[PDB]
């Protein structure tokens, strides 16, 4: 709901930076949305208004490769559930300020 990512057990906010930049690819397959309740929160979006901007640079570059992955696989006769859940991360914190610059 709100607070399991917000409570004094708050290392999982920092651990998901380790569990995205260093995790396994089947672990990263479901690791992305785990900060969703953090980004639905305004306070962690305020407590990590700049530290998430590290992670947005990681997840956007991986997001671009899927069009080089999936479309080129379809470009052979002429997995995206990660990409489904990757965009589930970016949806709450895409509205906030100071993230639009690296978005553009």
């Amino acid at each position: 709901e709100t607070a399991v990512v917000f409570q004094e057990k708050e290392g999982i906010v920092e651990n998901l930076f380790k569990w995205a930049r260093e995790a396994d690819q089947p672990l990263r397959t479901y690791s992305t949305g785990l900060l969703g309740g953090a980004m639905e929160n305004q306070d962690i979006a305020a407590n990590y208004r700049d530290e998430n901007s590290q992670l947005v640079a990681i997840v956007l570059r991986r997001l671009r490769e899927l069009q080089l992955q999936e479309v080129a696989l379809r470009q052979e006769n002429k997995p995206a559930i990660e990409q489904r859940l990757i965009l589930q991360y970016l949806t709450p914190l895409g509205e906030y300020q100071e993230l639009l610059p690296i978005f553009m």
Binding site: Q97, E98, L100, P101, M104
Partner: protein
């Protein structure tokens, strides 16, 4: 501020002391000169030891002076010959003809 990559403005800092303005002029992108209805001049300064966000949103008044005259205008530009001392030149225009 103006962050062109952000597309909007931004409050860098602000002086809090209620002085009734008459005329302002930027001096050297660090120091800011202002005029007052109480016939006075003062320079504010963007702060340097920005140890927190509260100590960097507060402009500091560096310098106070009673130019006993009401300042309307400020402008750049000297009135003497450029022969190519001090740095910069700000003239001002008042209500008694005192440049």
């Amino acid at each position: 501020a103006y962050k062109p990559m952000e597309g909007n403005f931004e409050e860098i800092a602000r002086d809090f002391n209620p002085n009734w303005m008459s005329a302002v002029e930027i001096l050297d992108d660090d120091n800011f000169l202002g005029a007052e209805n109480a016939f006075n001049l003062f320079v504010c300064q963007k702060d340097s030891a920005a140890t927190t966000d509260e100590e960097r949103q507060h402009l500091q008044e560096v310098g106070l002076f009673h130019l006993g005259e009401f300042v309307n205008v400020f402008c750049h530009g000297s009135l003497v010959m450029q022969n190519l001392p001090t740095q910069g030149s700000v003239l001002f225009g008042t209500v008694n003809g005192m440049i």
